[PDB]
């Protein structure tokens, strides 16, 4: 398809590279980093963890990642140009609606949120200028009215511009097939959104099916197991109580029924959060010390480990994320 | 001295205050991510400060603008359109009915270090300072709504800064806010109980006010009527008519309180917080937007035999001795 827009602009498809397709620099509410940056001890101690941790992502051959922070979730879009031109890591922005949507969007219509969604996508964000290249749309428990809207005005902005949708489908219930149902309503193609937090279930014939209708399916939280910290409800809560390599073994056995194509694969990482429990980086660091570069260095050898071939992982890395992120009508 | 959105200003200089309004009700970061909603921020502008002029030309000097960060408060808008219109306006710090989960998930003291960022060091990166606590509590209250009197309480104790209250709902809930406040050491001096025009309970208005609360009589032009076929104003306005709002004025005065009473519109330029295009429903029952009380609420006082000097001391006296720091 087209070029992908980032915030230090339009790239290449050729120069998206190693991708990191869903991720967090900093997760929060719209204005809060603006208002209380020393909730994260600074501005400048936020921009220098997330530096920090992006150029080692990058050493471990990353070259993109997709912040799917929306505004509701506290994208700063002047936060990630920082970071992405610091850290010299491409990142694609984005626009949709997370779990904390305030007032001033559950009053909306579903044309008043396409036409949201249109000038984040086409126009760009704030006074920016930076353009979204990725709707996020977030649904917890069953489906409701709200949510049903939301999804229909990220699938008619995805028709009207090429850029695809990703979903967060919590905790795991397994929505993705009364997402799938009411994007194709829209007449939206299956190729143009990800299922994501797909590794929070382990039912196999869920995912299977999925993504045997074309659906990419985001298999996205890799790192995040409370396993050792049960003493700790929160952690628990947010990161769960499966391994690590269970949630890896879901991508060999997606490739071993036919479906590499698929597969898109992340770490849903933060270098700051004020949106749960304070100080919840801390736990995350604790289990993750290598932060956005747990795909690379640990979870692709893994699979190398049990004999998947390397051209398979390049193309799930590579190959995949760019025709996701690539503009296609 | 008191803070406005153009630094300090002298007690004397700050005249004729209306203690609550708004320039735009919407969410944190609302008007900077999608100002065409309000066709422009310069349509905004230009709209807000043609009411602040009107509002000026009636008298008006001051407004106290009680939006909080989750009710989008853009201190630049408001710096701005003070600086447009020659009307001081003060700022908020608190939380209103809407918080995001940034906020739900805090405790009593981080809510309180965020309150008293905002009105010890400034909002945001602009060193405006807030000059007021705002609290919201609709219906019954829960945890969360007495974690935030007791934060509100404490950073109104730690700055001299005074404490207003947003009441909806359940009967008589200024006195479940009073019951805290009062239980932190907070004197009922430094706290307005607001939209108490919202009751006929005069019995509870002067109980109150005997207390030494602050009696908010701030929602007279949202009164309505003859938009029965519009339900969406009477669950946002109301079925009353703004002269028996405005009755409760001349009755706590008569009761012997016109020191604790606080009159204002509760209005805005600009709303997305609720439907589409309620500004234009709005505007429609009341023309007059923020000169409502000095063009029709102070005349109608003043036809009931008020007198000039207890008009003054309502709308001038009262403002000063609540927003000082003390
Ligand atoms: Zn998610
Ligand atoms: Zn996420
Ligand atoms: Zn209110
Ligand atoms: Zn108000």
């Known amino acids: ?42 501005r400048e101690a936020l921009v220098e963890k997330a530096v920090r941790g992006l150029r080692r992502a990058r050493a471990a051959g990353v070259r993109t990642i997709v912040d799917v922070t929306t505004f509701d979730l506290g994208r ?59 709707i996020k749309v977030a649904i917890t428990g069953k489906m409701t009215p709200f949510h049903e809207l939301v999804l229909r005005a990220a699938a008619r902005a995805s028709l009207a511009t090429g850029v695809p949708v990703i979903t967060h489908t919590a905790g795991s219930q397994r929505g993705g097939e009364q997402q799938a149902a009411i994007f194709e309503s829209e007449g939206l193609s299956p190729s143009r959104v990800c299922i994501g937090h797909s590794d929070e279930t382990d039912d196999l014939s ?29 952690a628990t809560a947010f990161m769960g109580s499966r391994s690590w390599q269970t949630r890896a073994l879901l991508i060999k056995a997606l490739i071993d029924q036919g479906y590499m194509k698929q597969i898109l694969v992340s770490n849903d990482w933060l270098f700051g959060i004020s949106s749960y429990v304070t100080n919840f980086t801390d736990v995350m660091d604790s289990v993750n010390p290598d932060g956005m570069a747990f795909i690379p260095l640990r979870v692709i050898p893994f699979l190398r480990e049990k004999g998947t071939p390397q051209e398979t992982l390049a193309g799930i890395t590579v190959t995949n994320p760019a025709r996701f992120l690539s503009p296609t009508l």
């Not at 399916?217 to 700790?232: C, F």
């Open 1 to 42: 398809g087209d070029r992908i827009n980032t915030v230090r602009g339009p790239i290449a498809i050729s120069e998206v590279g190693f991708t990191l397709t869903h991720e967090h620099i900093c997760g929060s509410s719209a204005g809060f980093l603006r208002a209380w940056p020393e909730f994260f001890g600074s």
């Open 76 to 134: 700063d879009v002047r936060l990630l140009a920082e970071v992405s031109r610091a850290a010299d890591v491409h990142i694609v922005a984005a626009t949709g609606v997370w779990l904390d949507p305030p007032l001033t969007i559950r009053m909306r219509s579903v044309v008043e949120l396409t036409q949201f969604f249109l000038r984040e996508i086409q126009y760009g964000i704030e006074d920016t200028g930076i353009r979204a290249g990725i």
């Open 206 to 234: 869920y995912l299977t099916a999925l993504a045997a209708r074309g659906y990419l399916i985001g298999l996205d939280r890799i790192p995040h197991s409370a396993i050792g910290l049960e003493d700790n409800a929160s």
